Design a protein around this ligand. Structure first.
Ligand SMILES: [Fe+3]
Ligand SMILES: [Fe+3]
Ligand SMILES: [Fe+3]
Ligand SMILES: [Fe+3]
Ligand SMILES: [Fe+3]
Ligand SMILES: [Fe+3]
Lengths: 164, 164, 164, 164, 164, 164
């Protein structure tokens, strides 16, 4: 089936682009907003987005017999004003990748291709896991106004059976 | 100094592009040329190119006070015919990054910016180290004709005080 | 060469004077500004400035055959108003010692005296390391207004491969 | 009481000056008189003179409520002829610091300031301890004429309940 | 570049010749001057001169792509009169190899060949290290006149972070 | 006896020359014939030829009362075409040193100098041991034609009561 091929290629592309964008956001949050631990958090997100999230697609392509296509285009020319807008933008990106994964899963189940469904279950779980991990931090900036308190909270954060 | 800034930005861009290209080459060498261990070798190269090689530039920029710029554009539309041409192309890329690093070091020393010189010494070493690691394998395909012998050699390979 | 001798003697003198000044600043920050941990931080700076930073110059003089000269004159008759101005003054002193080291390195390389260059590389690294360590704390007083939060941050602070 | 303040400030100044002078003497004894172990001995003396001997005064000032004053002036323009005159000069400096401490203790007891007396007991002990440690070595150069025998003796030296 | 090739070939030749000469001097100091430990010292020097000091040049030639040339010519027909002249001659040889290394480093930096500079830094350090190790012993024969005292000193000698 | 002196001096000279020649052959076999393990083998041979094989003669000369003479002259201006001719030349050198040792032993026994006979027994054993070790490898190139198989054999080789 070529529809699953196209959808998984789109997901590969999206994952690479998000990895690079998150890396840049982590750097700019460390260098300008004077919050190194928000930088470490977004850097861990970027590493997970550039590692297993695309290595698994490459491996599945090796295993079932599809063709891979590399095509990336990223140019970060705009950044938000403070840490709150930055973390809300990261949250929106996660909320979008959730819907993309849902669309791929529906397409796979409508093709009678149950190996691809069993494959995409991992993503329909990890999407919610990571969105929750990011929402836990976007909730912080609604709770206090001293930067160092939020810093220590995120520090102790970085220091389940269904989802986790 | 802005010249060092421009040169290091160019190096950042080059490193990201090479990382992606090497990842694709590793996959296509595993999937088509029936050599998984050449795939593992090129994958380790891609990981080193996408990790520390750009994280160190990001950290140095954080530390001295320069501005980072993300701009990538990669589209792999051509691949070689057999493993020998693939490994020779990888070798050529390494031979090019060597010259790029040499130019950066000359520019840094001609600016009276000795912190950047002390910083780029690491790269003028790692360039030769990695070029040697790749030449060791491009020498293999001039020595035998059975694929599995080369496979076992690379397997035992993956299994100094100045350079290393 | 006598020019390198004069430059290294000037550096010896500067290091001794900075050691004493930092010791006094640590005491006055402990006794008046009610911040003992800022005192401990500046005391560790003073110890590093009065120890190895001049012992290494004495050793190099013993080793290559130059003459040492002791001449100190310090009189701290003015102190800043609050901890922020104190830490900014410490930062300025670090930013000055950086330029002094850069000048010595240029002079050494222009003399064809490569042993002195290999010797001063240690200083062109440690300058950036220590300036970063002090900037990390001068960033704190732009982030909060409760003294004890900054205290706990510095406490957990006191509790790399290129630079560090 | 301000008299104790003045006396302890004088002792602080004297200790810093002696520290620097002893450091220079250690270097010149290592570099010219071809005796590295006499250098190590005088260096340990200089470290003890520049460390606890003034840190304790700084701490006591923090604790009782007096003001500290930093004012140093050292210029070593003359050095003795051989190791014997050097060690005799060090001995004379110790014999002088003994009398200075005795004067401070008398002044403290004549003021009805018994905390300062309890504080200065440590110094009236350490003075005799260190003078004895130096006399043990100035006795050596009255016993032999081979430099290396004295060297081995001092080496094994560097390798009580009332005083010690 | 062929100039660096010629210079490194000259250094290879010089190192082999010095190795052989030092071996002969060690033997003759053991057999005639009745000092076995001076023999052991000079033998360790000869081993370091014949081992890594030329193996590293061979390895660098393998690594960058230059050609090696073996041409040796040694004939020890004259020896000094006592141990003092012997150790002073060894010292002079070290003082000469220092200048040879300095010339090679200048030539490398004037060619814009920074890999050779990074390579020769090791030698510009080891030269000073070894010259200091030999001067420590040539200082002994200015301190005493009993042979066995010097023997025990050298015995305990044979029994840093920048240089060492 | 001076005849034994002359013969042992000749053996000393021969051993030094063979050491240097073998070192060069090891390098050229690593750099040109693309066989690093043959290089390691010949390097171990060169180390044994330059170490104990001449240190024992130096020690025996110290012990019985003869005079040592250093005179070397080597110029490697010709090398064979492939690894087989190289290893056959090494074998011929071993076959020659065997006969030289036999001649020395006959001369010693014909002089009624039984200490020299007891001394040379070690060499009349080690000659056969080393010739066998080299013949084991010159037999390999008569058994296969893939370079990497021979490589793995020599690798596992490098990884008795009369002779050994
Ligand atoms: Fe994830
Ligand atoms: Fe690398
Ligand atoms: Fe420091
Ligand atoms: Fe003391
Ligand atoms: Fe050495
Ligand atoms: Fe042998």
């Amino acid at each position: 089936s070529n529809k699953i091929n196209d959808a998984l290629n789109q997901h590969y592309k999206l994952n690479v682009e998000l990895g690079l964008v998150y890396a840049h956001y982590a750097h700019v949050a460390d260098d300008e907003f004077d919050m190194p631990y928000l930088g470490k958090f977004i850097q861990h997100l970027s590493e997970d987005k550039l590692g297993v999230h695309k290595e698994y697609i490459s491996d599945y392509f090796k295993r079932n017999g599809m063709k891979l296509k590399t095509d990336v285009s990223v140019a970060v020319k705009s950044i938000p004003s403070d840490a709150k807008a930055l973390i809300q933008e990261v949250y929106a990106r996660e909320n979008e990748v959730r819907d993309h994964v849902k669309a791929i899963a529906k397409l796979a189940l409508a093709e009678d291709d149950y190996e691809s469904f069993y494959f995409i279950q991992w993503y329909v779980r990890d999407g919610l896991k990571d969105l929750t991990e990011v929402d836990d931090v976007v909730k912080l900036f609604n709770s206090s106004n001293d930067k160092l308190i939020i810093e220590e909270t995120i520090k102790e954060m970085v220091e389940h059976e269904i989802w986790g």
